[PDB]
Amino acid sequence: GPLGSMTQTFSSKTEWRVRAISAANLHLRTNHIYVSSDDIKETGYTYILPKNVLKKFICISDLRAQIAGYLYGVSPPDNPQVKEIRCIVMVPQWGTHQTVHLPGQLPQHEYLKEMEPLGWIHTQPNESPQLSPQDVTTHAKIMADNPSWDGEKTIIITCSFTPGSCTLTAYKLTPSGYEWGRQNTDKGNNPKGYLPSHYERVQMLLSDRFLGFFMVPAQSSWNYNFMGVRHDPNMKYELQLANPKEFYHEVHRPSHFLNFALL
Amino acid sequence: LAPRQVLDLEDLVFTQGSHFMANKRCQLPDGSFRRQRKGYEEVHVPALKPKPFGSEEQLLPVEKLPKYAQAGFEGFKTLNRIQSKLYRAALETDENLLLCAPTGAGKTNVALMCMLREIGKHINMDGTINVDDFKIIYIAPMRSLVQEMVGSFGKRLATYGITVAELTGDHQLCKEEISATQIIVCTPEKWDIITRKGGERTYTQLVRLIILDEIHLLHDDRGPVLEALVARAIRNIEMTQEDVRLIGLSATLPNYEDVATFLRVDPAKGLFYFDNSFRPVPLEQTYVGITEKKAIKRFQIMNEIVYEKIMEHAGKNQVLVFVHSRKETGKTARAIRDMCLEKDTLGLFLREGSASTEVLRTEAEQCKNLELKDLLPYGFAIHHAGMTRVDRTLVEDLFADKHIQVLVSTATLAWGVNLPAHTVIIKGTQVYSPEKGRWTELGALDILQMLGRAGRPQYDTKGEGILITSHGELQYYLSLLNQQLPIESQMVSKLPDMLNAEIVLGNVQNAKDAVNWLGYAYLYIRMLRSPTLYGISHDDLKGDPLLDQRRLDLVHTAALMLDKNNLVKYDKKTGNFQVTELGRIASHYYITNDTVQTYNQLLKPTLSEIELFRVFSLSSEFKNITVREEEKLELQKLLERVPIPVKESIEEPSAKINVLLQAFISQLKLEGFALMADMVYVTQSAGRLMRAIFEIVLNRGWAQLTDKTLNLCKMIDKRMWQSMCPLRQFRKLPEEVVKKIEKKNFPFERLYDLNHNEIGELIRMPKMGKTIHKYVHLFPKLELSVHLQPITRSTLKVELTITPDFQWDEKVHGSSEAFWILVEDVDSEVILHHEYFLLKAKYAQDEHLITFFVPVFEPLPPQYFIRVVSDRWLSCETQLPVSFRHLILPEKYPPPTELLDLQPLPVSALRNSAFESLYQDKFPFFNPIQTQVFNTVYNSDDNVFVGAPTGSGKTICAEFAILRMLLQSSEGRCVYITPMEALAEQVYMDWYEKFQDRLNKKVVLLTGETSTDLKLLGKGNIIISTPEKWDILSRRWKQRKNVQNINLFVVDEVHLIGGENGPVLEVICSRMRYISSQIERPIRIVALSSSLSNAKDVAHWLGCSATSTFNFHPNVRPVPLELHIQGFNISHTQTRLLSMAKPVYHAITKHSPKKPVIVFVPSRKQTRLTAIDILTTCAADIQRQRFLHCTEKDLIPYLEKLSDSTLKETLLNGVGYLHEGLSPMERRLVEQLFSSGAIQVVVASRSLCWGMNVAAHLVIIMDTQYYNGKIHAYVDYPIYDVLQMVGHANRPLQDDEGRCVIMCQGSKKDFFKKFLYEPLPVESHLDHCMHDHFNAEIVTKTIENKQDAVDYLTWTFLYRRMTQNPNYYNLQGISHRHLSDHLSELVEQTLSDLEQSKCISIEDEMDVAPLNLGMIAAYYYINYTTIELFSMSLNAKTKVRGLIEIISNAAEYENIPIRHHEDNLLRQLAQKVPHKLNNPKFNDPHVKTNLLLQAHLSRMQLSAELQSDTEEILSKAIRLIQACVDVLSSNGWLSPALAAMELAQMVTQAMWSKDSYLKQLPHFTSEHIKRCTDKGVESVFDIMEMEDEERNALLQLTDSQIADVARFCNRYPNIELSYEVVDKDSIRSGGPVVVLVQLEREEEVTGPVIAPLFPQKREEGWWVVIGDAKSNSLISIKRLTLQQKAKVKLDFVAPATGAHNYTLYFMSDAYMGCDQEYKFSVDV
Ligand SMILES: CON(C)S(=O)(=O)c1ccccc1
């Protein structure tokens, strides 16, 4: 019985600080990246992700809120069954632990006109035996709105935060996966109709032989996880040839700095 | 040395700092008495009685001072008592002084007298002061004191034109304010950090006087700074042997004699002690020591005591109360006034119905300050720093006229304002110290100053000081104020940091240097005099009387400390100290050594802002900060709201420090008193701590962390985060508009696109759209572009262009804006290149070109980035992506020519006994390269290319070709071009011996004189020349047969076409090729070069067959080269040279202990410094004279001929040096001592790497940069110089190998590996040097139209390289169309520039023709821009002085930038010289030429290096003058052309127009002139006609001297002049007027002009002029060179029948006084 005896006051806490301290350590995982490429599939299309941009993509991310980048590349001159990822494009986005929210508009820039869209990559808190139904729906709706995304050619790379490390897996949709995903409204973890035959794993190799590069928005940054209302599926954006800033960088959370000035 | 002991420095520290009381007892003055009261004691000390003068004491009136000094004492009648005792010592000797007087006795006026003596040292007869010839340092302890000193000294010395100033602290470009100032006034710490940086600068050598005011600060924790300053000054004086005057000013306290010893003050001459009776106003002192231990009671007791003491003066006397906070001032004023209201005493301060209240009525009601509002009407006032300046001046002016009755203030008033009060109360002696983390006693300086403010100097008959403190402190303060608190040294804690500062400067290189350094510290003197006070038993002292062992131990302890923290590397055995970059940073940013170890341990390229703030919070400067329970609540509130998360807990002081910094940036106000003071301390340190972190991570190349830390520096300095609107950095903008702009949440860059209307609309405020617009464009902004020039497949040259895109406003941007250029890799993680870039105000509108190198690799990476970031402005950055998608890399270079294993070639192969005699004595076989090239060179006529390292003997290959020429014909002409004049002269010596002496051929060396050089080309079979001397010749090859009939053209060192003067070399080689193709008689070309990667391009350009192109690479050098490239981490040049000092010695002992060594150094000063340093290291190695290999006595007759004493000393120990400042005979002595094997080591400057007749076994290249003084920046050694230097390590007949150690900055190591181990790619830069050659070729009618110009370009190396490396030349492709367009654009731009300059005419946009201006530019080899400037300035009436000036301002005179010190000399030259120049701006480059010309013409004296510069100026002068003559006569003006010819005369003879024509004669001083004017006429024919009897009776000279005089008189021109007018009987109006002048010299004189003060030998030039001075018209001019006889004809048109007096002129360019005039008339 407190009665009048015991009274304690609430000192606030905040989750983004713990996550920010955590995100400062993401560079440790970049020395320990594993590709879960021991799969039944043989040949098919083979995707080559350069290590430099993958490491950068890991360092700018968050351990809770997924982030995503668009993949662009080409085939080596005389080997068309191999796709080399040459560029990752960060666009205005905001995520949760289960999904990311990207604009309807796809990257547009003359510097990518000689390249080929190869799909997307995104972080994920935990490894999973199967491809998420959120991912199937996302990829299928992007395919339905953008005919340049070939079902036989665009992939979903998941970068999962295993303890001390990052584990990569690459998937593609099947025609059944496409058709189911483009008509799915259930955001839940088990929407009706979702099947494992909706995707298949594709071959994926990390390489040090060549370097990728990044493109980022021209008039903002990519992270909107602190400016959710400023984000809109119909937002338009331009791009520039530059490297992206980490998740908890100051330009991504201006209200923190402007509101601490109010005591 | 060997049995050291490691001490505990902290156990030797006086923990109480300035509160340490060394005296056991205090004797109070007679009449003191002790009273008791409840809870406290009082001690009363009566005022002292002045000593009533003395035996020889009289007050000196200003009349009796030296007269230059009286202006400094204007407004005063007589010096005071102490100034009168001090004036002789202070103004009439240079003796170091120490003056001990009580505060206000007049010490700063004695310092003024010392200043006046120094000022008098620099007074000219023109009255002015040589303000640029000296500097004086006044060290004051407090900033407010510094500012008051600046004001008062400035007012006292304005009458001298002397500036006094304080230093800002930025010193970005603000060290300029050091050079502007004569009297620098600063704190000890500021002067310490400045002189710690210790880069080469003039201020150091200008310092003549240092004043250490309030030197009893020695006893304070800040005292060690004074000790460091003094030890550094005295050791600088030892090294420089120039004396500096030291003046110390102190209170009267014990150990003043030890302070005197410490200042090198002779006690008899320079020590003056004045006891406390000499105080201006006697002081009745009251001390109150409270016994109460409990705060609550003690505080009210203090308020009661101050109330009772105030009442003893209310209405009778003003009272100044002193408090140690800005809040407690008002708090105590309110306490007193409340106590007065409660007791109805408030009316005693304010007289009822008196005048004072009236003045108080208004201001008090105005209530400018709020606490002043509550207090001012009642008679009270407060005064502190947070107040406004005008409020403080209000309080001051009110108090001065006796209107305020009680003024509560802080120490700041006591230090910065001259406000005396009759009664002073010091309320408490406790102050919070954040550095210490607790409350401590007041510093002694503060107490002395405050109580010195007691008693007004004129109005009061005594003062009353009332100190209130704790009882236990009574003895202390009694001591301090009564001459009994002894001054001790506090430096034993600071010893590591201070020793590191000396190590970083290089003043202390080992433990013996450190011991000697410490022997100058005040700690050392105190240890000698009171050993037991400093932890030394008296038996310890007797066993070690000079305290050698003890100082060794202290130094050893400090060195171990610094070495554990990685500031130094300390070798215990040798005692040697090695400097490190971390140590340098700790010193230069005033960081303690523990903090730098922490930074080194925790900094990582992966750190985020979180860990960066934590790292900062761990600085040792903060080690005493603690988190108090009473703070913990407020801090917790901030901890969960700070924008940068804090990992550690509120219990840890690092978290409190972190949160305090972030609160400061967020500009939050806090409540806790300790929190505010702790924040102030933390954040005052933050700026320089974070700049140290910045410099650390920047020099490691850490891109992300560099960005974050520079940002954090700026966020600390501007007090705002990046997110804030950058516009609030404009402090003139309102806060609410920028709050609106941040509330609109749009990108700031968008504001650039808008106009003032849209700007008003976006923010919902139209009224401001204009001003905002202005500020948007006042914000600094830079536009960037690149030109990518590939060098190889792995090295890329980048030319970055920076265009400013903002409006400059000096109110906002000052005089300069600073930026960092950062070239970062694909991932923005590695800084591949960086440099500082300074946008000066005068260039705020120009484009700036930066160039640098970066590595690339294959496959090419996507892009690099170039960021240009402001050094000061937040959110001020431009990043340019540098994509490589369209980069065209040149081809991989081909393999070298295989060196064939051939039988070595005997000399017998020449098969000519006369030929074989050239080399028979020297060797029996040619080296492998000569062997491989011999057949092609000697037995064929093919054009040949030989590429090989320096030291491969390519000269012998050229000699092979010359001997083949000599076998084909005896009248063959070989021209030999080499790019350097020193090389040309050395080759001239060697080939003169070989071909003239031994083969009876004629070897000549071109000089620059076109007549001389044309005669030499005629005579010679071997003609040696530099490229420009052959350019001016071969330009007119169509008119000169001797240029065309060249049999052999040899060009040496042809890889120098890639270098700074390469275009001229490329042009002349291309011209020789084109001449060969035109004359149908082929000229054989031989090209010698360093190893070229693109050799085949050169060979094809010069027409060498592939079987005739020998492309060897560096590995084939006949004497093998072991090359070691050693990288040095230090980015500060002077420190890096220091870090190289010992590796130089170690390299000698490792690579060449007994064989000779050359050390190349960046500068003339470094030659001597390094010679001495090598000798010092030799001595400490107890191998003192290892480098001397001859006998001393066999060497001393050599040494007698030197004039450099230090050079003689070093030579005595086997080490020479060589620099431009030595006389040529000194150089030759040193060179022959080195080649004879006498001396083993010689240290030469970089400037001499082309003219050294000396080779070595080991070459050490000590650093690869040098300071350019024109641009005030360090410049990399050209690769060509480095190759030449490396080539000096090669002795084919003496050594089995050569060795070379290149010591360079780490940043450049890999570059050297790529361009020294591999052969060199070379490129043309002719496309930047086009105009003068197009002009020449339009004058010679080789280029008659634009198509001709394209065809002409097709002959160049540039043209060939354009297809091999298109991107380097800004071509996009190699299609024939591409380079056709490129050549057309280049041609179009060049001909457009020429036609605009009026050098050429362009008709129908196709045809080009030479104008007379272009013909003159081409004839005299003048830059077309120079001739354009001449054509603008000259017209028909400009002074000879204007001629001198325009000539000095000509493109040809931008060369030598060594001197900025001599500028003032030139100033005082302007008065001496007849040249009264308008617009007297003085600077660095062309005006040096102007008044150096002035020095020459009036025969003034100059220095050695300056003399070598004079010679170049005179080398260009005659051609420029002749161009002026040529423009004037073409226009028809008669007087100005004659004046220009007389200027030619004055330059040749070094005289003037009206001067005596006897000054041309040898040995003829002005006295001979006055003698010759007496019964004589000033003429040299007059001298000739008298007989040597009367002659010698007048001249008063030696017989050899009159022989020289007669030689001149015989070479003086004496000629028969005859004039005739052909068909004079029948002249008709129009064209036919012909004058015939016959001239005949008698003696057929041979030899050149006699002009000893002119460098090059000249030939007698003449002008025949027909005109009329009445009309100022010249009709007929012809230039003539007279032999034994010559006839000249001249044409002229006869307009109308009329007047006809005609003035036939005969004018010389060489001699003054031979000009003849004949006049006549005849009509048409
Ligand atoms: C501490 O160093 N300084 C006080 S100093 O002004 O640079 C100097 C320079 C030369 C001779 C003496 C002193």
Short mmCIF file of C-alpha atoms in Angstrom, two decimals, chain A residues 11-14 16-17 20-21 24 27 52-53 56 110-112 114-115 209-214 218-219 230 241-243 246 249-251 253-254 256-258 260-263, chain B residues 606 608 610 636-645 647 662 666 668-669 704 708 715 721-724 742 745 747 749-750 826-828 857 859 861-863 865 879 881 883 885:
data_model
loop_
_atom_site.label_atom_id
_atom_site.label_comp_id
_atom_site.label_asym_id
_atom_site.label_seq_id
_atom_site.Cartn_x
_atom_site.Cartn_y
_atom_site.Cartn_z
CA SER A 11 11.58 8.98 -16.50
CA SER A 12 10.89 8.52 -20.19
CA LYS A 13 12.65 5.95 -22.37
CA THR A 14 12.67 5.62 -26.14
CA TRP A 16 14.94 4.44 -31.29
CA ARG A 17 17.91 5.22 -29.02
CA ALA A 20 20.46 3.59 -32.83
CA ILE A 21 23.18 2.26 -30.53
CA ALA A 24 26.11 1.65 -34.83
CA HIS A 27 29.59 -2.90 -39.51
CA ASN A 52 31.00 -3.32 -51.61
CA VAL A 53 27.39 -2.22 -52.11
CA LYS A 56 27.06 -0.48 -47.48
CA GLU A 110 19.58 8.23 -67.74
CA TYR A 111 22.54 6.66 -65.89
CA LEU A 112 20.51 3.41 -65.61
CA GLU A 114 21.75 0.93 -70.35
CA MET A 115 20.97 -1.37 -67.40
CA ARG A 209 35.98 -8.86 -58.84
CA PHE A 210 33.99 -5.69 -59.67
CA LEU A 211 32.36 -2.87 -57.73
CA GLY A 212 28.77 -1.69 -57.61
CA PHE A 213 27.50 1.82 -56.98
CA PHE A 214 24.48 3.52 -55.46
CA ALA A 218 18.10 14.03 -55.46
CA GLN A 219 16.14 16.41 -53.19
CA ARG A 230 5.58 12.99 -45.21
CA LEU A 241 24.87 9.37 -58.29
CA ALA A 242 25.84 9.40 -54.60
CA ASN A 243 26.21 7.09 -51.61
CA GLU A 246 23.05 5.52 -42.45
CA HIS A 249 21.80 9.96 -39.64
CA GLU A 250 20.69 13.44 -38.58
CA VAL A 251 18.96 14.35 -41.85
CA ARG A 253 15.34 12.60 -37.98
CA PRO A 254 15.36 16.42 -38.01
CA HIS A 256 14.83 15.08 -32.75
CA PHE A 257 17.38 17.89 -33.10
CA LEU A 258 14.77 20.64 -33.54
CA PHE A 260 15.60 18.95 -28.13
CA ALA A 261 16.22 22.68 -28.70
CA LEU A 262 12.80 23.17 -27.03
CA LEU A 263 14.27 21.58 -23.84
CA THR B 606 33.54 3.01 -38.29
CA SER B 608 29.20 6.97 -35.44
CA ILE B 610 27.36 8.29 -30.64
CA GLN B 636 18.37 12.74 -16.44
CA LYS B 637 15.77 15.01 -18.05
CA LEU B 638 18.29 15.89 -20.74
CA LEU B 639 19.63 12.35 -21.10
CA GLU B 640 16.48 10.84 -22.61
CA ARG B 641 15.92 13.90 -24.80
CA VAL B 642 19.41 14.44 -26.30
CA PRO B 643 19.40 13.83 -30.08
CA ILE B 644 22.63 11.78 -29.96
CA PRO B 645 21.97 8.66 -27.81
CA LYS B 647 25.16 4.62 -23.96
CA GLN B 662 24.73 18.45 -26.63
CA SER B 666 21.03 22.91 -28.63
CA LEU B 668 19.55 24.98 -23.68
CA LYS B 669 19.75 26.94 -20.45
CA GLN B 704 32.99 9.19 -43.03
CA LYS B 708 31.23 13.73 -39.01
CA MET B 715 28.12 22.60 -34.80
CA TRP B 721 22.80 21.14 -35.59
CA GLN B 722 22.86 20.44 -39.34
CA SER B 723 19.06 20.20 -39.35
CA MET B 724 18.74 23.88 -38.46
CA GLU B 742 12.33 25.27 -40.93
CA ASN B 745 10.15 21.57 -44.13
CA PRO B 747 14.98 21.52 -48.96
CA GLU B 749 18.64 24.23 -51.87
CA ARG B 750 15.21 24.83 -53.40
CA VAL B 826 33.55 4.54 -54.78
CA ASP B 827 32.24 3.78 -51.30
CA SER B 828 32.87 7.25 -49.78
CA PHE B 857 42.58 0.36 -61.36
CA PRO B 859 38.26 -2.92 -64.19
CA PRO B 861 35.47 1.58 -60.70
CA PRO B 862 32.09 3.30 -61.22
CA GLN B 863 33.05 6.76 -59.94
CA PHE B 865 33.64 11.78 -55.62
CA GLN B 879 29.90 17.05 -54.24
CA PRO B 881 30.44 12.65 -58.97
CA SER B 883 32.13 9.02 -63.48
CA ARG B 885 32.11 5.29 -67.84
#
